[PDB]
Design a binder for this molecule. Sequence first.
Ligand SMILES: Nc1ncnc2c1ncn2[C@@H]1O[C@H](CSCC[C@H](N)C(=O)O)[C@@H](O)[C@H]1O
Ligand SMILES: Nc1ncnc2c1ncn2[C@@H]1O[C@H](CSCC[C@H](N)C(=O)O)[C@@H](O)[C@H]1O
Lengths: 350, 353
Amino acid sequence: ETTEEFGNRFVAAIDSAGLAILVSVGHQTGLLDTMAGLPPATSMEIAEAAGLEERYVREWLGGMTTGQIVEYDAGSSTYSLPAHRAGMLTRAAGPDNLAVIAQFVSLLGEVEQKVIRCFREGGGVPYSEYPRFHKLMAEMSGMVFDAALIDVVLPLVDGLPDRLRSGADVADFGCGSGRAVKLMAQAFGASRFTGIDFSDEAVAAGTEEAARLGLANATFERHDLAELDKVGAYDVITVFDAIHDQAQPARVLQNIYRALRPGGVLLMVDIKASSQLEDNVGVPLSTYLYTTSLMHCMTVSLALDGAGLGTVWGRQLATSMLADAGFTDVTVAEIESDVLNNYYIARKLE
Amino acid sequence: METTEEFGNRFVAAIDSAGLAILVSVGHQTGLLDTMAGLPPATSMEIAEAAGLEERYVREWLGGMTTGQIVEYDAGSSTYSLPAHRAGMLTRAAGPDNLAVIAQFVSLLGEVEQKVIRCFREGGGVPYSEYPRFHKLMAEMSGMVFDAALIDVVLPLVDGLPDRLRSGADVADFGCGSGRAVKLMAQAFGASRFTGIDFSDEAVAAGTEEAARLGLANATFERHDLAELDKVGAYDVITVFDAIHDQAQPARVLQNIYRALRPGGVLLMVDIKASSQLEDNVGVPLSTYLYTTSLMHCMTVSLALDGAGLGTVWGRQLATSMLADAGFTDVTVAEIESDVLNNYYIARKLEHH
Ligand SMILES: Nc1ncnc2c1ncn2[C@@H]1O[C@H](CSCC[C@H](N)C(=O)O)[C@@H](O)[C@H]1O
Ligand SMILES: Nc1ncnc2c1ncn2[C@@H]1O[C@H](CSCC[C@H](N)C(=O)O)[C@@H](O)[C@H]1O
């Protein structure tokens, strides 16, 4: 490219950056929701529907309109959210709602300055500086869990579903807020599940939902995955997007191997990307992935003097690290439902 | 006709793009972009050592920069380069031309999203006090622009203004802020007398110290609320830079500028280049960015004060109308081709008494 072209590109980028933010706001406010449930309408009409300050809404619509998400009729002075677009930005779109992931732009922006300090000074930014994250992660993750865990993900392991039905001891490591555990515990009443996280927040949350639903077969424990006394205690262990952000990932992978009874199974769902940089160029979401890794997944590990592999550790490294942990039978799967993650299946001999 | 499959891709690209912004915003603040411009193809290690920064962070930054396509990468030799054509628009060496500066605003708007959202629900707005890093940055980049072209480009737009100031005329700058404007003019025009007005004492005191330090007798500063001025036929010349749309009571301020001017006096108000019609702004670069800073900042700061909240994109048609409401029956709107972000509204006051 030449110079004129870059500026256009880079200017457009700034406009896109702003657009992202606007979408996140539309999500959190239910504007995007409200508009999907509406015909063409005026700023005041849309504000009234959403139960919001028209003024704020008016400017929102402006940005959305220039960014070509919303459509405004110059003649009638009404705005409209094209349906083909509303099914990609609304809660009702289930897993398809892309407005969720835009929330991360602001969340990452919140620590730009603390991050820049680590470029100069080393160390990293701890989890406690990202209070909003648990909720976003739960939501981002929750989309794929409700959509696909029980009927798509668990069936990737032959006979696992049957096994659960029969009864088995199952553990979710780095469980977060216990969503997957809650779904599985209702789904398989004869199996007993335990979820583990080092957060009080997550354990509280997962711990709570179960209290509410009376799911006896769900139980929650706070532990650090790098140090555990579980030996041969689980037939099945899952870990959903928790490995790359660990401080001592190889150790957790050893700790998983020990806690599995022989013939047991590890299902690690982690981000899909190459461990080689060149291979990620022009792939959608890579720039977003590296950003988050730098501003979150990469730094939170480093803050504990950890490994800091980041979000983009990749397939190659991830697999050979399962090899190193003792998993001699390892296969990688993917699903249409989740474009982001690989689904690594790893077995322990009997 | 755009297809949903198609939108998804555009919006994912958008998602990628926001991250790319932040990376550049970081690269500039870190001094990384500046650093690479001065290097030959090098390794993540070499680049981090060259910049005096932590390699691991530099590496994550480099990766995104590579995927975003800004930075080029020879995987064969594990080296990166910043192409000269790109280095040009992201380096501090471009002074005012550095694009990288504006990227910093993604995080700055990021930092207030939660408070802004609350506003949708409860009204009011986010107070000016919560935006210190934002203010200091604007002022730093305007300041370069003033250094770059105020005397040789901006003032000459007002026909016969260089002479008026050369001979010596009574000048005021409203919303002077840091005061860079006042300094440059008072340097270039020893004959004229300048006054800087702002209501932030910090700024006022600051300027006064700067004035005295440089020994400029002609420069002066005062703390006033622009909306509460009682000045009457004090100034031959009044300059206002990008400080009207943010006001609580803009109409009043314009009415106060009319009143403070002498008959035969001139107002130069610099403000954002946009239409007041929404339709007109679609397809014009940066429209989205501006509507965003407005909702996210310029609009709310006013609303916080029960203000007008006209916003960053109040536009030309509304600005001109407002001037006339204020009393100016003679107004021309100038543009400079180089500057695409601002309109230079030149409003003249009638000579009779
Ligand atoms: N050292 C550690 N010990 C236990 N949990 C850890 C940990 N380091 C990170 N984690 C967990 O890693 C999780 C990342 S996100 C949570 C994953 C969850 N399956 C979901 O999709 O919501 C965090 O919730 C955190 O609790
Ligand atoms: N009501 C008011 N009275 C006086 N100054 C005001 C004001 N409202 C806003 N301002 C000024 O608006 C300024 C922000 S913009 C500053 C413009 C400056 N000449 C530049 O181009 O860098 C603040 O410094 C503040 O002093």
